[PDB]
């Protein structure tokens, strides 16, 4: 379907978009006490894999799944909350602020770099077709 | 006609590229409609189908000749939105640029074939 460079750069754009979405969702839920049901929100992470591809030497980026972070959930002593345990510590998400801003900046700069790569390749693509005519 | 058989493949490819271009631009235009599903066509299978009818018979002059009159596949969503819109900007922008490039390539190939058939005749 897609040309190889198109597929690689578009996969890069989609992967960076997914990472940015995960960072934004984490930054939104930084102060959430309970989730859909009653369990604390867990910071999400996105794992980048290289599309194996038949070539292997050349391949884009895919995202296998969004994993839930395994870090000590923040404990805040609020015994009056219905979600407090026997000891009374309500669970707050493990979303760090600085890491998510750094992730947003890095995802944005990778997105823009891949955009620039596509823009650079395009002119050569359109100029290839003038070879025959 | 034998002339049609030579130019059938490139004409059908060009028409299919134009139709898929229209579909992709419709996906772009309806990006903000809540509940809109992103639709697309599988180019190779439809090209097989078109490449692989019966004009009604006209007995006299008054008799009227026969009057003439693709399948869309849903795109697999990547991110779940809240309004039900599954159109992804990046994926369809890349597909749109690729379809534009392939339409230009098909135009180039068809023009080259016609120009060769012409310089064979010129003299």
């Amino acid at each position: 379907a897609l040309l190889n460079i198109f597929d690689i750069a578009g996969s890069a754009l989609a992967a960076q978009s997914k990472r940015l979405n995960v960072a934004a969702s984490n930054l939104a839920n930084a102060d959430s006490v309970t989730g859909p049901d009653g369990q604390p929100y867990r910071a999400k992470q996105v794992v980048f894999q290289v599309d194996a591809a038949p070539g292997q030497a050349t391949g884009g980026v895919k995202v296998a799944s969004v994993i839930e972070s395994q870090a000590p959930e923040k404990l805040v002593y609020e015994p009056g909350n219905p979600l407090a345990d026997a000891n009374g510590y309500v669970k707050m998400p493990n979303v760090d602020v600085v890491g998510e801003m750094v992730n947003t900046m890095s995802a944005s700069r990778s997105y823009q770099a891949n955009i620039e790569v596509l823009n650079t390749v395009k002119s050569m693509m359109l100029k290839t077709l003038t070879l025959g005519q | 006609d034998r002339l049609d058989a030579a130019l059938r493949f490139q004409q059908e490819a060009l028409n299919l590229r134009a139709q898929r271009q229209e579909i992709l631009a419709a996906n772009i235009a309806n990006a903000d409609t809540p509940g809109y599903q992103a639709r697309d066509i599988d180019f190779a299978s439809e090209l097989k189908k078109v490449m692989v009818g019966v004009a009604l018979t006209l007995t006299s002059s008054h008799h009227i000749p026969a009057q003439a009159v693709v399948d869309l596949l849903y795109r697999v969503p990547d991110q779940p939105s809240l309004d039900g819109n599954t159109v992804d900007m990046d994926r369809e922008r890349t597909q749109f640029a690729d379809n534009s490039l392939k339409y230009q390539m098909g135009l180039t190939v068809l023009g080259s074939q016609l120009k060769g058939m012409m310089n064979v005749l010129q003299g």
């Binding site: 859909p36 | 849903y74 795109r75 697999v76 990547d78 309004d83 039900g84």
Partner: peptide, 21 residues
């Protein structure tokens, strides 16, 4: 399967409830 593939089936509706039903 892969995000961005082609399937003959529309995706299920995207519901996000606020409370458990």
């Amino acid at each position: 399967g892969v995000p961005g593939a082609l399937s003959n089936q529309p995706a299920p509706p995207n519901e996000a409830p606020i409370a458990t039903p």
